[PDB]
């Protein structure tokens, strides 16, 4: 806000001003892999890949 | 007080003197603004301006 001195303030009132800032977003981050059915007989690699992705 | 030396001191009596300091005021300090009634449909800027003024 601005300010002002004195008693008589006639025709010296100010207006308001409020400023702003924008926030935006980018592109998603992915881990994306493919796996055949027979490769899921042993599930350690799949789970470890999930943890390392996190 | 003054201080004086000797025995006689005749015709050398002093007077009394007390000094003064004056405190006064200044001009009033103001935040003064104008708004049309259409600007008060959303009054958030008005309240935030009041806070800024304080």
Residue numbers in the entry:
A (entry chain A), B (entry chain B): 55 to 108
Reproduce text from the manuscript describing this model.
Salmonella typhimurium bacteriophage P22, a member of Podoviridae, is an established model system for studying protein assembly and conformational changes in macromolecular machines under different functional states. Approximately 250–300 copies of scaffolding protein gp8 and 415 copies of coat protein gp5 bind to each other to form the procapsid in the T = 7 laevo icosahedral arrangement. In addition to the conserved HK97 fold, gp5 has a distinctive nonconserved domain (insertion domain or I-domain) that is inserted in the A-domain. Here, we report the cryo-electron microscopy structures of procapsid, empty procapsid, empty mature capsid, and mature capsid of phage P22 at resolutions of 2.6 Å, 3.9 Å, 2.8 Å, and 3.0 Å, respectively.
Compared with the procapsid, the mature capsid expanded and became more angular, the sixfold opening closed, and the capsid became thinner. The structural changes of the capsid were caused by the conformational changes of gp5. The N-arm α-helix became a long loop that projected into the gp5 subunit in the adjacent asymmetric unit. The tip of the F-loop transformed into an α-helix (residues 36–42). In the A-domain, one of the two short α-helices extended from residues 172–177 to 172–184 and the flexible loop (residues 190–208) became an α-helix and a fixed loop, resulting in the closure of the sixfold opening in the procapsid. The P-domain and E-loop tilted, resulting in a thinner capsid shell. The I-domain was largely unchanged, except for a minor shift of its D-loop. The salt bridges between E81 and K249, as well as those between D246 and R255 in the procapsid, and the hydrogen bond between W48 and T46 were disrupted due to the conformational change of gp5. New salt bridges were identified in the mature capsid as compensation. For example, E5, E15, and E159 formed salt bridges with K31, R42 and K216, respectively, in a neighboring gp5 subunit in the mature capsid.
